[PDB]
Amino acid sequence: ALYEYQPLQIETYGPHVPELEMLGRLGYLNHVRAASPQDLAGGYTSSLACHRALQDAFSGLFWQP
């Protein structure tokens, strides 16, 4: 029984969030703080912060109790 990758299916009840690799091409990174060389050395990029902020802004926007 071979394995086939299947992406995680989690409903967010909000607008679609652009992909992390596409944030730079779409101009999102122009409005976040640029990561310092030390942050890049440790593996931290501004794309992560922008993606998290965008995910938080859209989560549960179309949901009612």
Partner: protein
């Protein structure tokens, strides 16, 4: 994340009527326990006292040293609101519960503060500070158990920042989305006073604050909802969102701050209740 959080699952309610029912049930339960009288305060008086002590908690966290992150203050306020949904001020004193809420919020939000420097922010004698610390340590487990062990609180500040980033990126019509920050922050502060945190999602609250600031600035961004957010495909979703924003604005506009004379009378009544 919020879309599978315990805040959405267990601490977001349909309407203010359910909140009033829960508060009345708590008051009635404490009255029944006491029986098993004019001194008892009514649920609306309990609400007035809770609002006054929430303001006291806000000004306590405002002058906290070292500087307290705003997320910690929001977490403490949410803890206070959740605790007094199913508890009466006539059983647990809100003066100590606010301090326990601030203590637990500082612990949960990874804001490292030791107990001596926490109690040093109180305008009390060292003996009074030690007594307050002992009360906080006694009530910490009670606060945790009354929260159903749901300590992660989602605040509208991160969704607000994300919405601002999206407006700066995909909405050239709004030339400078940074001019709406102050009024949106004021609207968020006014939202925090009402029961909006227990009835709406943080993203909805942030969007409501942003569009309230835009309306007060004379800017209309119905295209941002319809076009940028792809709501022109789903019209009923747009109508529901607009109705949610209108309900939030109505909640904000009808809130009445507590009055000093009533606050003093209720404080005397609460002191009489707790002494006896």
């Amino acid at each position: 994340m919020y879309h599978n959080s315990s805040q959405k699952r267990h601490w977001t309610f349909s309407s203010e009527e359910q909140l009033a029912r829960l508060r009345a049930d708590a008051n009635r339960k404490f009255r029944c326990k006491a029986v098993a009288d004019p001194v008892f305060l009514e649920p609306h008086e309990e609400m007035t006292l809770c609002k006054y002590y929430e303001k006291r908690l806000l000004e306590f966290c405002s002058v906290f040293k070292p500087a307290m992150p705003r997320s910690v203050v929001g977490t403490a306020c949410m803890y206070f609101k959740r605790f007094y949904l199913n508890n009466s001020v006539m059983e647990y004193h809100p003066r100590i519960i606010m301090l326990t809420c601030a203590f637990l919020a500082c612990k949960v939000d990874e804001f490292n503060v030791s107990s001596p420097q926490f109690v040093g922010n109180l305008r009390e004698s060292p003996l009074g500070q030690e007594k307050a610390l002992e009360q906080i340590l006694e009530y910490e487990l009670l606060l945790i158990q009354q929260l159903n062990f749901h300590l992660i609180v989602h605040n509208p500040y991160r969704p607000f920042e994300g919405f601002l980033i999206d407006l700066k990126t995909r909405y050239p019509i709004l030339e400078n989305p940074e001019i709406l920050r102050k009024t949106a922050d004021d609207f968020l502060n006014r939202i925090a006073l009402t029961d909006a945190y227990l009835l709406y999602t943080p993203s909805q609250i942030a969007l409501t604050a942003i569009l309230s600031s835009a309306s007060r600035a004379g800017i209309t961004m119905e295209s941002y909802l319809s076009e940028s957010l792809m709501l022109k495909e789903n019209r009923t979703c747009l109508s529901q969102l607009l109705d949610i924003m209108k309900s939030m604005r109505n909640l904000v506009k009808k809130y009445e701050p507590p009055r000093s004379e009533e606050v003093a009378v209720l404080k005397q009544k609460l002191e009489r209740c707790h002494s006896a």
